[PDB]
RNA sequence: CAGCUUAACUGUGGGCGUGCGGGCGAUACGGGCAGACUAGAGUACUGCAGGGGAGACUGGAAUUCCUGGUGUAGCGGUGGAAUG
């Protein structure tokens, strides 16, 4: 309902860019993905899709009263910084950035190498 | 060398018979026997490094799953998609 300070969790993969604006406790109040802002397939992986996703989630959060946001970015992607700029432009102001990508300690064998 | 005319062939004598057995010598090398030595080898002492190995216990990250909140419509995935 009212959350002045929030957290923007950004999962930017090689196939999408999901953005979840949450309270600092982690309860989501808004989110947006490329598919939600009207994309499909491989265009979801573009930075522009992340621009729009971040913009839409930021607007839905502004509706709830979110001004300062701390970012928690994860995933290689290409629309990370694009989403940062989008949040900065969609009315919010970013306080802190953090690469929270999972770094396993050599556990859980990955999938095989693509040929 | 000699003789059948020559040669082949034949004969005579020597050498060969690459060895073996006896005898008599030599003893450098190998070997045997009897010893000696420490430069090899191994032991001892002091130190040192090391994911060497085995057993037991145990740690955190991460994935997955479960449960519960928030949370809503897509996620995932590809060269692009579709199954899902």
UniProtKB/Swiss-Prot annotation:
The keyword rRNA-binding applies. Keywords: Ribonucleoprotein, Ribosomal protein, RNA-binding, rRNA-binding. It comes from the Bacteria. One of its GO terms (biological process) is translation. GO terms for cellular component: ribonucleoprotein complex; ribosome. Residues 97-115 are annotated as: Disordered. Belongs to the universal ribosomal protein uS11 family. Located on the platform of the 30S subunit, it bridges several disparate RNA helices of the 16S rRNA. Forms part of the Shine-Dalgarno cleft in the 70S ribosome. Part of the 30S ribosomal subunit. Interacts with proteins S7 and S18. Binds to IF-3. This is Small ribosomal subunit protein uS11. It comes from Mycolicibacterium smegmatis (strain ATCC 700084 / mc(2)155) (Mycobacterium smegmatis). The lineage of its organism: Bacteria, Bacillati, Actinomycetota, Actinomycetes, Mycobacteriales. The chain holds residues 23 to 137 of 138 of the full protein.
């Amino acid at each position: 309902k009212n959350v002045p300070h929030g957290a923007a969790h950004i999962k930017s993969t090689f196939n999408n860019t999901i953005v979840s604006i949450t309270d600092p406790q982690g309860n989501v109040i808004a989110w947006a993905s490329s598919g939600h802002v009207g994309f499909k397939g491989s265009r979801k992986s573009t930075p522009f899709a992340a621009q729009l996703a971040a913009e839409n989630a930021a607007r839905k959060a502004q509706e709830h009263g979110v001004k300062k946001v701390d970012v928690f970015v994860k995933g290689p992607g290409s629309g990370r910084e694009t989403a940062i700029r989008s949040l900065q432009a969609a009315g919010l102001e970013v306080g802190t950035i953090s690469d929270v990508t999972p770094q396993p300690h050599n556990g859980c064998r990955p999938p095989k190498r693509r040929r």
